[PDB]
Ligand binder design. Structure first.
Ligand SMILES: N[C@@H](CCc1ccc2[nH]c(=O)c(=O)[nH]c2c1)C(=O)O
Ligand SMILES: N[C@@H](CCc1ccc2[nH]c(=O)c(=O)[nH]c2c1)C(=O)O
Ligand SMILES: [Cl-]
Lengths: 250, 244
């Protein structure tokens, strides 16, 4: 029985609706559980889903130690990390990633019918307010960016005690709906939102690029085996099917 | 020395301008040549560039036999494939790809300041005409697309909306109420030379170019790590603006 570390994140991993207490894997549902089920069928394994105790994806601290799902893999307390775990340079040094089951990037959430076309257009004015989730990977991107357009945007975002920023995605979406505000976040989030709000849309293309992949400890045999399975699922069109099932609104 | 197979394709790989005949790697320049240089300064290796003899990227015939750069990697006549090589399922069965060093696809070239936000908006109206260059890669997509929103667009392109080359499509946009559907690379080209035009929305039929290695290559993981390092450093973006 494999130990699968994961994290609550709509619509990847969610508590299953019930009128009676549930136990084990039946407690959870979502894109990642459907993915995991398929993985266990193709590769032939038993698995137990365990939410990461600290509720974090994985980062380094001041002392240089890891936490979250990344740490659970490193310490071999989990065989697989099946969650929207971002494939990054720093993580690739301590854990292994399969082929990304999903590709994405930073983009713009805003209203329909407006003349705004791109990040370029947001940066050249101060009327339409814009920002991102505080201390998220999107804010970090703009914070470190040496691109002139994104430097101008960051200087704006951080001005006036960072009032343009928001606490989380839910707050950000609400701000977009209620005020004249454009939110910067992952294209996966934006589509989840736009499918459930018919007067919102994505503006422009992807600002950066990365992927979500299944994480394994370094040197694990499951790394190659999952990549093979994901390729098969991609070829069958099942990955597109799975995304459609959980992303569509009504 | 590592043998690097590649293919001529502007502006990834091009012949270097010269008064005299050039030799070796200096014969070539472009986006992929810069990437190859940076990759060699991260991993640390020597390399010899060799154009794929048949001039093909890599496809399979009726017997399932491969050609092009893909075949060169299979036969171990090349250690790396640094080129605009599309990451596809059938290719991933026989060779290894790194993480994409470039993401592209189909998008819309149109005017600035308009209420148009996506391909969906064009598909649900008719006043603004839209199309693509005939029998181009963009056209081939919409045809063999079993996605109705793109089928409905193709139905409208089939009713004149198509153009001969990218050069006609550009001017047709500038002069008429027309939206041009083309590869995102060709768009970035145009929008830099025409300040009144812009890309509308994101990518359609999105795909990635990855570095190719033979299956079981010891450079695989190293290349992926290097590319991650390069894009997160923002050097891949810088390389793009340099050659586009
Ligand atoms: N809701 C968004 C992103 C979810 C999300 C939020 C924070 C993350 N932090 C990490 O460190 C990581 O690897 N992945 C993460 C994914 C979506 O639906 O794609
Ligand atoms: N001109 C465009 C795309 C170049 C291009 C054209 C045909 C291809 N055919 C393949 O099979 C393949 O793998 N890559 C290919 C790349 C650009 O500048 O990016
Ligand atoms: Cl919260």
């Amino acid at each position: 029985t494999l130990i699968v570390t994961t994290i609550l994140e709509e619509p990847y991993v969610m508590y299953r609706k019930s009128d009676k207490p549930l136990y084990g894997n039946d407690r959870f549902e979502g894109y990642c559980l459907d993915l995991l089920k398929e993985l266990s069928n193709i590769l032939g394994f038993l698995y137990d889903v365990k939410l990461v105790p600290d509720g974090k994806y994985g980062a380094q601290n001041d002392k240089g130690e890891w936490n979250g799902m990344v740490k659970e893999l490193i310490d071999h307390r989990a065989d697989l990390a099946v969650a929207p775990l971002t494939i990054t340079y720093v993580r690739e040094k301590v854990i292994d990633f399969s082929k990304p089951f999903m590709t994405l990037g930073i983009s713009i959430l805003y209203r329909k019918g407006t003349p705004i076309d791109s990040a370029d257009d947001l940066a050249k004015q101060t009327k339409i307010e814009y920002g991102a989730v505080r201390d998220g990977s999107t804010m970090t991107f703009f914070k470190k960016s040496k691109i002139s357009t994104y430097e101008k945007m960051w200087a704006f975002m951080s001005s006036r005690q960072q009032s343009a920023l928001v606490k989380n995605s839910d707050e950000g979406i609400q701000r977009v709906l209620t005020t004249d505000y454009a939110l910067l976040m992952e294209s996966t989030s934006i589509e989840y939102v736009t499918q459930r709000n018919c007067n919102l849309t994505q503006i422009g293309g992807l600002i950066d690029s990365k992927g979500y992949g299944v994480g394994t400890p370094i040197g694990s045999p499951y790394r190659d085996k999952i990549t093979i399975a994901i390729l098969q699922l991609q070829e069958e069109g099942k990955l597109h099917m799975m995304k459609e099932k959980w992303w569509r609104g009504n």
